[model samples]
Target: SHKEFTKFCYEVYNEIKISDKEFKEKRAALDTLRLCLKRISPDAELVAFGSLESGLALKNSDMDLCVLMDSRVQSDTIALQFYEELIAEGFEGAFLQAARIPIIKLTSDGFGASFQCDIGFNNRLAIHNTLLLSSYTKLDARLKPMVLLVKHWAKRKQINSPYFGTLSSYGYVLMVLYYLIHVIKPPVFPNLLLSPLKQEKIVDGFDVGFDDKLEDIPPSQNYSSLGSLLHGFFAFYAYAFEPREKVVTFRRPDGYLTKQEKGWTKDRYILAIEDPFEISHNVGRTVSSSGLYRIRGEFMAASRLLNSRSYPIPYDSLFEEAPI
Candidate 1:
């Protein structure tokens, strides 16, 4: 029966995974936008960040991108002009200059159907963030499946948006990593950022490690079936995790932290998750009190459903788009 569940995960992956042809076609569309951007700002470096670029993206997921530039002082006019050019090219979206950083949201220019993209100015940290995620992905095979499973679950539960006072996809990935590395025995991977003789790269003053010292670290040969791993993940978060007292941290060697020490004591932020390289950042800041309630409720419900004896039917039922 667990084998059936494990096989079902592969089936979900098949439907959601991006094919080689899909990637090639999708990226070509992005390149056209990059070319258009180059004419506006000679140094405009458009980057692909988030799930799509990080290699864990589900099928038909919108691409997250940023257009890097040298400075922000004079980019408004350039950004406005870029918006005008987008409209001219028939890839119209929105030009939001009022944003902290100017943004160019495109509905569907050169991008194929089912693909909508956002291009922001000088979001350089996002690239490093993607690098951090992409690196973790390479450290172990288990990480990918677990991440995909959780991400799919979150998408169904509808708590994956930071804009709506909930966690981002990256936040979910970090939670899963914390469990594998900190909660489990013989961690799937050593704390890559805190390991001895770790290789590091600095971006925007944050130490980003390029390699995870994989030669010495071997993958989880014990091979807990996917179904067990999924249930364990749900059960751990649903009941074992302390929301207010402790914060889940992947960057530190200790793999844990107190909310008080980090100044995340504000009642508004009951759940805190520190960004690995960005020491000052709290990715959980986006989640509101109501959002936390919703997320926790889903975790408990999922844990219950999976742990049930009857084996919840239409396994697809678990992945239904989460209630709004």
Candidate 2:
């Protein structure tokens, strides 16, 4: 176990940093856009999702925002119009999607700041009314805690490297949750399904639907049998079982894992919500069922992590309070 952790640390040292001044600049641009949206649609709820919201955003990561609308308004047309309006107002890189879910896209200009905004509509009524009741069933309480555990585990283990592998932190989070639910017996969450036909209708950018298969089967699929799945899931589950201990100390000033005396705080952990829709928007891909599963898990895990004070150390003293 320690060997795995050490290897993870070594790999993290080689992977690229996910945050930089450029990201902050782009985030500032997003803040401005958020403010503008608030002025225009005060009733609409604007939420951040994706890696940035999840705290796993790395170098080259983009900003993602979701605009949840009230029942009286149509989100898709408004999203398109908003995209065009932003372009007219000087965001030249704006575009609109006509996919199963219409969305607005934007890119930053040459100021070396770039970000994409995805606009989606959420009408709770449609699910209850639609034939796709199975799809709606997937949205359950258990999903949140599972996602939080995987995300926190990945960040804590420093396995959130994108360059080393095609998988994003969000991707791995999904994989873990999928394993827990589908493969592992006594499934962490119940199966939520979309009619095979309904799945065919909800096209992603290239017309692919939820039923489309990934190019490669994940390693967890090797645990298709109940026995293997249980064993493998438990192995990682035990690694994550808490009394979670995280510490950083410097052996050398320039060492990779070293916590600089003043430049960075030491042995700190923070509770933050990681949303799946945000991850999909950042990657410019459609959010998968697995992605949604992980998001639910993360939300639940964050709730638990913040509320529990059973750890060996006092959590309050670990880091400075975040800004309001």
Candidate 3:
């Protein structure tokens, strides 16, 4: 019954999948930036966090970067210098000093193709988190399909923005990882940053763990196909997940923890999602109460569309872009 529809999704996923040519071109662009960064500071690093490093990036997705400041330097001065340098290099965007951590948003077509790049300073924790996610991507082949599809779906529904009140694309990726690690029965893979397999070396304060011998932990034998996993993902979050009652955890032995115990309810109805290694950071802090309502509503709608009787225009309906 759902076979043909599932097949259609797989075909679409393939058609739009990132090609090797595109991957190399973008990678080359990053390398060019890396040289500029080296010129600024020998110890400085231009690390790409999500989508770029993860390889699940969409064609037009913005590049998320963390400018890790390893050397002791005046961060404020350096950030502004970076802004001036990019300006001189012919890219235009804002340099917001007011941001919790200063950031520069630059858009350029100088990289052979158009790119929107966000550069944030001293974000090492994010890089480690990306390392953990990249390792997870290697666990099972089906995961990329699920991640790519959900990313597209979230963007379509216009709920994938943390600044706009819902969540970031990276936030959605964590939600998917939580589902695969804990929600699904016969879990597709073990939790990377938790359990006996979990280990981290604390540097400065946060654990920047990069030990990726995760395959040594032995993968669980999951027989479910990507189609079934996607169905279960939507269904679980739509109905089974209790957003207000609990916090979805990643670096814990348990499936989840109580909001009260974790101090998640410290603020009130904030969707609590702990950063896997950087424990203090709440990835869902930007999701306001109204944003949660809209997000869950979309999740519910996705669940219904997939579970209900077959619809011919399923792809079009599910993949509708944001309102103009």
Candidate 4:
């Protein structure tokens, strides 16, 4: 039964979820890094964003750090200077200068495990979105498990890298939000952007406003089991979301945008996911045609297996790590 499948999701989440001790360790590591950054540039401020900040992170998820500085200099220039100072101080990471936002990619130093991290400068937009995702997770109990499982599945299948012509963990989580907010019947989450009890603020010329008050929005009529919701997510992306045309957007009440409306004529980008606050940013912009094919194939496989009537659904195999 779908209830059994839901039980499996919770079990997996419990086994791999971050504990309070682990979270404190991460915080200590962040503080250590922040101090290092401050020593190099006294005025620099550091904060975290992404899965960890959003509370939907898997145990092995990477940290996303944003450095804010008061200087009027360009971000890359600041990042470039910081990179030199950081490397000189014995901190290690690759300096990716060619990226849309130049960043330093760091590996585990204090975590004693495979801790991956990226540091970018003045990413106020990401901070807001991270808060947005964190707020959404608090509204529904099932959201955290569902998102974590999908992220894990994406990692196991090796499709979670934005640089590798796939998607970011952020993109995957937004997809889950889109599914719950608009795709599922009756919807598991309200479009918080539309809530009346909102705290509106403009950042980078975009309204980053959202209602954090959970009581402001009415409860969802949909109470589907976790497994059923997961299946529906896969099925929707596999078949319902016409990859060639439709855009996955949740800012609106109806939750969608057209490629033509966005002037996305690129033929290679088979998937389009708009950033909730940064409306023009396509979160799925990295997904190439081949990447989309692999993603859709995986979605179809998961949807099929979850829909099977066989006893004790083949969910274990669904999460098995794919071959390189």
For lDDT, the strongest prediction is 4
TM value for model 1 = 0.87
Give each model a TM-score.
0.87, 0.40, 0.88, 0.87
lDDT of 3 by residue, 124-190 (tens): 7677777778888887888887888888888889888888788877788889999988888888877
Candidate 4 C-alpha lDDT tens digits along 1-324? 578788888899887777877788778778877877776677778889987787887775668899988747567656777777666655676998675768788753456546677898878888998898888888888898898899889999988877888998888998999989888887888888877777789987889998877766666788888888987898998788898988888666787678888777542447888888987788888998788888998898888888887776777987899887
Q: Once superposed on the true structure, which residue ranges of model 2 sit more than 4 Å away at CA? A: 4-17, 20-23, 97-101, 110-113, 123-171, 178-324
Worst 10 residues of 3 by lDDT: 307-316
Taken over the whole model, the C-alpha lDDT of each candidate is: 0.77, 0.41, 0.78, 0.81
Number of the top TM-score candidate: 3
For candidate 1, list the clashing residue pairs, or say none: 156-321, 156-322, 157-322
**How well is each residue in 53-156 modelled by candidate 1, as lDDT tens digits?**
88888777777888777764578777787778778877767777674568877786535445588877777788888877887788776677778888888888
Cα lDDT of model 2 by residue, 97-146, tens digit: 55656666666543444555554455322222121222312343323333
Worst 10 residues of 4 by lDDT: 107-116
- Taking every candidate in turn, the Cα RMSD to the unseen true structure, in Å, is 2.8, 17.9, 2.7, 2.9
Rank order by lDDT, top first?
A: 4, 3, 1, 2
Count residue pairs with overlapping backbones in model 4.
Answer: 0
